[PDB]
Write a protein that binds this ligand. Structure first.
Ligand SMILES: [Cl-]
Length: 175
């Protein structure tokens, strides 16, 4: 197990644009494109939003994709996105010290969160980050679950939280 295999499990692999639970058009292995309008937002609004997502994808791939990519392309955006998550952690004054204090497995769990919620979002978990830095694993686990993140994607958050709790890959074994 490693950060790529871990995120591939949590994000899945879809070759056509889809909408995630937060309302973001997404594709590949968790590659976020743009926000979608209301399930009502006018007939025009919808087409606009979809074309805006297709435009973002074309820009990312460097080709006219029409909202569909190959597995190889999804893996390329994934390599870029994992790289970006790590880079985000290292340039952030709040996340870097926590990342540096963690072991490899727990580092992967932090990259997983940043990949899902972005640098700024994770850097805002001030109390959980402090508990992680203090190696108070069970306390950090309890605190991390008190979040919209956990409530919206509980099965995934539980695996990430268990990874911070144990410092092992047990939550991803047999998946
Ligand atoms: Cl991109």
């Amino acid at each position: 197990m490693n950060i790529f295999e871990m995120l591939r499990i949590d994000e899945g692999l879809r070759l056509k644009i889809y909408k995630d639970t937060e309302g973001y058009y997404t594709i590949g292995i968790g590659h976020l494109l743009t926000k979608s309008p209301s399930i009502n937002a006018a007939k025009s609004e919808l087409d606009k939003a979809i074309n805006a997502a297709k435009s973002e994808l074309d820009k990312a791939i460097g080709a006219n994709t029409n909202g569909v990519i190959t597995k190889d392309e999804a893996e390329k955006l994934f390599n870029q996105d994992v790289d970006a998550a790590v880079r985000g952690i290292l340039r952030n004054a709040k996340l870097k010290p926590v990342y540096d204090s963690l072991d490899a497995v727990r580092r992967a769990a932090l990259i997983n969160m940043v990949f899902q919620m972005g640098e700024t979002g994770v850097a805002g978990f001030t109390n959980s980050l402090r508990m992680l830095q203090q190696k108070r694993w069970d306390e950090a686990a309890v605190n991390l679950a008190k979040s919209r993140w956990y409530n919206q994607t509980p099965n995934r958050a539980k695996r990430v939280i268990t990874t911070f709790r144990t410092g092992t890959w047990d939550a991803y074994k047999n998946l």
